[PDB]
Ligand binder design. Structure first.
Ligand SMILES: [Mg+2]
Length: 97
RNA sequence: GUAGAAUAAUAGAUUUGAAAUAUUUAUUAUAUAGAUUUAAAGAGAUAAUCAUGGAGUAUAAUAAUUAAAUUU
């Protein structure tokens, strides 16, 4: 098996109720850095992806993240940017078939 | 210029399915292994630009008069 999720190896679970979900959402809304997706997953025996699907974090956090990303991008050299672009192009190509 | 219909894009509202091949789908770091790749100080070729040079080309008092031809 190559690059497969844990849910495929051991079947999907629908154990988590509505109240729990609500709680999770609330937590996400409250403190994203303390209650990050990974942490949530650990808590409720469930995928980070699932958590993400369930619950949007505070938009401020998202904005901050975006800013950070931008900063990182800026910090790049010329060559690296070009390389990144090339990679992106390659990725795009590799869904054509 | 105004009004109404057909289609496209963008935004909003209301629904929507889903634990979504997230031990990488999108993207960011660092490490350890490997593997490679990217020069232009100058140059070649081709083209163009600015020259140099003066081959080639036209002309040989360009007036006046004579005759013819062509337009007013
Ligand atoms: Mg080069």
């Amino acid at each position: 098996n190559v690059l497969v999720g844990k849910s495929t190896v051991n079947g999907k679970t629908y154990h988590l109720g509505p109240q729990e979900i609500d709680e999770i959402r609330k937590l996400r809304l409250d403190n994203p850095q303390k209650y990050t997706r990974k942490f949530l997953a650990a808590k409720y025996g469930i995928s980070p992806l699932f958590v993400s699907m369930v619950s949007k974090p505070s938009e401020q956090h998202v904005q901050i993240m975006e800013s950070r990303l931008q900063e990182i991008q800026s910090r790049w050299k010329e060559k690296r940017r070009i390389a990144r672009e090339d990679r992106k192009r390659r990725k795009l190509l590799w869904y054509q078939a």
